[PDB]
Amino acid sequence: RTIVVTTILESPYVMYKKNHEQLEGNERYEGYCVDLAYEIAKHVRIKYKLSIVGDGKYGARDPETKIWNGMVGELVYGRADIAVAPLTITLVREEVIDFSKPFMSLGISIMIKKGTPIESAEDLAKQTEIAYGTLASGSTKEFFRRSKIAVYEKMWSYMKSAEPSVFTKTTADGVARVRKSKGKFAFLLESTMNEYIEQRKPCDTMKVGGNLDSKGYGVATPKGSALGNAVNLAVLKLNEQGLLDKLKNKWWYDKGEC
Amino acid sequence: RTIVVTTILESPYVMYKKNHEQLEGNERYEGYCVDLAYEIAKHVRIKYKLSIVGDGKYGARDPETKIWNGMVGELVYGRADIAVAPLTITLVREEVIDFSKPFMSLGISIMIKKGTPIESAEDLAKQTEIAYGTLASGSTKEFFRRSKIAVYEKMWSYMKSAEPSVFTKTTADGVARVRKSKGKFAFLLESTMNEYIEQRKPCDTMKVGGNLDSKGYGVATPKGSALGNAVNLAVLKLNEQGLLDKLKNKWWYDKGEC
Ligand SMILES: N[C@@H](Cn1oc(=O)[nH]c1=O)C(=O)O
Ligand SMILES: N[C@@H](Cn1oc(=O)[nH]c1=O)C(=O)O
Ligand SMILES: [Zn+2]
Ligand SMILES: [Zn+2]
C-alpha cells in the first residue's frame, strides 16, 4: 500500500532539512521534488515513502554487465515504484522504463567561474588551458559520448582522455571544482542546476552561452506500471494549474542570493 | 498499409510549395512537420499520406455535443493514424489520444506591432486601448479560459466579452490583424509561431516579455495505437541526434529576413 519513491540528493530538488538528523521518514527532506512527490501523491491518491537511491546515481547500464544502476535500476529491478527526481528522459531509458510528460524543460549548459574567458562550447573545444568535465554516469556524459557533431566529438575526445579525471561523482563536486579552480575548470551540467547555483552565495559562478540541447525531466515508473497513466495526467494537471512554475520560483528564485 | 498522417496548414510547419497546384500528394507541401513526418516514417518504416485536416482546427471538444473536432477528432474517430503537427500536449487531449514526448518546447507569448507600449500580460490586462486575442478552438484560448491566476482571469474576462470578436480562425489572421492595427491589437500565440513571424518581412512584429507557460508539441496517435511506441522512440532518437534542432534552424532562422 505504501509506494516506494526513489529519488536523489540533488539541490534544490531533494535536500536534507536543517535539522534532518532529528527527523524521520519523508520529513527528513525538502525541495522541489519533495513538493512534487507530495502533490502527485495527492492527485494519484497514494501513500508513499521517499528513498534516497543507495548508489547516488541517476541511471546507466553497464555495457559488459548489462545491469542498470541508479534510480533507473531501482525501477527496472522492482525495488522502487516511482522515481520523482531530475531524471532526464532519454531514448535508452525509455526502452526500459516509462516516463511522464516533462515536468521541467532544460538543456546541457556551461558553468564557469565568473571572469573565465569562455562563452560557448566552441570556446571550450578550441583551447586546453581551461579544463572541463561532466557528471559521471548520467545523461550529460552520454550526450558527449554519443554525439556525431564535430565540436562535441572534440570535447568528448578531450574529456575521455583527460588526466586527472574531469568526471565528477556529483554535481556538487563539479561546482566545488569550478569554484576552487580560479577559472581553470568549467563544468557541463543541466541548465536547471546551473541556474540554481548561479543564485546561491558566494555568487561566483554563471551560466554562459545557449543550451546545447533541449529536453525534459519526467516522473518515471516501471515499464507497464498501472501507476503510469495517473502520474502522467497528474503532471499535466500540475503544469496547467501553474503549480510547477510556482515550485520552480519557490526553490530557484524566490530566495535567490545574487 | 499506407498510414494517414493528419496535419494542418500552419507556417512554417506545413506550407504549400511554390508550385503546389502542379504537384500531387505529399509533394504539395513543405515545412518543419513535413520533414519531421518524413524522418519519423523512415524510422518507423511506414508509407504515409499527408492529409490537411478538413476543418483547419487543432482539436477541441464541443461541450454540448461532446464531439472532438480538428486533428484530435481525426484520430479519435479513426480517420487518421497519426498527427504530425504543432499540436500542444494538454491534459484534456491526453485523456483521449496518445502523444510522443515533445519534439518542440514552447510557451504562450505576446506578439506586438513594433512600438506598441506593451511588455507583459500585466501590461495588456491593465488597459483597454490595445485590444488582444487568441486563436479560437486551440490550447491558447483554453489556457485563458481555464486559468485561476488573477492577471489571466482578467484577460479572459476582457477577451470573452470583447466586441468585435478578438478570436481569430487562424494564426495568420491574428498576425494580419496585428500588422494592420497600427499598434492597437496584440496577439497571444505560441512562442514558436511568434518567433517565426518575427523573422519574416515586413519585420514589423516582435515577441515581447517572457512566455506565460512551459509546454510541448507531441506527435499524436489514437489511444492504444501500436504505432505509438515506435513513434515516441523515433522522436527521442531524432532529438538526441540533433535533427530536431537542425530542422528548427532550417525553417525558422537559416533564412531569417529581419
Ligand atoms: N539529469 C541527469 C543527471 N545529470 O545532471 C546534470 O546536470 N548532468 C547530468 O548528467 C540524468 O538524468 O542523467
Ligand atoms: N498548438 C495549439 C494551437 N494554437 O497555436 C497557437 O499559437 N495558439 C494556439 O492555440 C493547439 O494545439 O491547440
Ligand atoms: Zn546534514
Ligand atoms: Zn498557393
Handedness of CA B152, B154, B157, B161 (dihedral sign): negative
Distant-in-sequence contacts of B155-161, Cβ < 8 A, 24+ apart = B155/B121, B155/B124, B155/B125, B158/B125, B158/B128, B158/B132, B159/B132, B159/B133, B159/B134
Whether omega for the bond prior to residue A202 falls within 30 degrees of 0, making it cis, is yes
Ligand 2 atom closest to B59 (CA):
13
**B136 within 8 A of B55, measured Cβ to Cβ:** no
Residue appearing with cell numbers 522522436 = B235
Distance from the alpha carbon of residue B141 to the mean position of ligand 2, in angstroms: 8
Cα B207 versus chain centre, distance = 16
| Grid coordinates belonging to B212 | 506565460
What is the distance between the terminal CA atoms of chain B, rounded to a whole angstrom? 44
Query: What is the CATH T-level fold of the domain A1-106+216-255, as seen in this structure?
Result: D-Maltodextrin-Binding Protein; domain 2 (3.40.190)
Binding site for L-glutamate: which residues of B? Answer: 86, 88, 93, 139-140, 190
Minimum-distance ligand 1 atom for the alpha carbon of A193:
7
**3 state SS of A234:** helix
> What cell numbers appear for A196 in the block?
540554481
Half-sphere exposure of B54 (CA within 13 A, CB side): 6
Instruction: Please give the annotated binding residues of A for L-glutamate, written as ranges.
Output: 86, 88, 93, 139-140, 190
As given in the structure block, the three cell numbers for residue A243 are 503549480
Phi, psi of A172 (to 5 degrees): -55, -40
Q: Helices A139-146 and A150-161: crossing angle, nearest 10°?
A: 120
- How far is A123 from A78, CA to CA, in rounded Å? 44
Beta-bridge mates of residue B106? B215
Give the nearest chain B residue to A94 (CA atoms): B233
Q: Which amino acid is at A88?
A: T
Query: For residues A132 and A146, what is the distance between their CA atoms, to the nearest angstrom?
Result: 17
Q: Are A90 and A139 in contact (CB under 8 A)?
A: yes
The binding site of B comprises 86, 88, 93, 139-140, 190
Q: Which amino acid is at A57?
A: K
Pull the grid cell for residue A164.
586527472
Give SS3 for B30.
Answer: strand
Which contacts qualify for B65-69: CB closer than 8 Å, 24 or more apart? B68/B96, B69/B137
Chain B residues with CB under 8 Å of A139 CB are: none
Closest Cα of chain A to B91: distance in Å? 6
Report residue A217: phi and psi, to 5°. -100, 140
Q: What is the fold, at CATH topology level, of the domain defined by A107-215?
A: D-Maltodextrin-Binding Protein; domain 2 (3.40.190)
Contact pairs from chain A to chain B, CB under 8 Å: 72
Could you tell me which of A30, A111, A41, A119 has the C-alpha nearest to residue A82? A41
Around Cβ B183, how many Cβ atoms within 10 Å?
16
Interface of B with A (CB under 8 A): 89-91, 94-95, 99, 101-102, 105, 143, 146-149, 213-216, 218, 232-233, 236-237, 239-242, 244-245
Q: Where are the domains of chain A?
A: 1-106+216-255, 107-215
Got the DSSP string for A75-110?
HHTTS-SEE-SS-B--HHHHTTEEEPSPSEEE-EEE
Q: Which residues of A touch B (CB under 8 A)?
A: 89-91, 94-95, 99, 101-102, 105, 143, 146-149, 213-216, 218, 232-233, 236-237, 239-242, 244-245
> Angle between the B32-44 and B228-240 helix axes, to the nearest 10 degrees?
120
Q: Give the separation between CA B243 and CA B247, rounded to whole angstroms.
A: 6
What does the CA dihedral B225, B230, B236, B240 come to, rounded to 10 degrees? -170
Residues β-bridged to residue A32: none
B239·A213 Cβ contact <8 A: yes
Alpha-carbon distance values, B73 to A70, B10, B54, B156 (Å): 41, 18, 11, 26
Question: Given in angstroms, what resolution was this structure solved at?
Answer: 1.9
**Do the first three CATH levels of A1-106+216-255 and A107-215 match, i.e. the same topology?**
yes
* Per-residue CA distances from A242 to A12, A249, B214 (Å): 19, 11, 9
- 3-state DSSP assignment of residue B134: strand
How many residues are given for chain B? 258
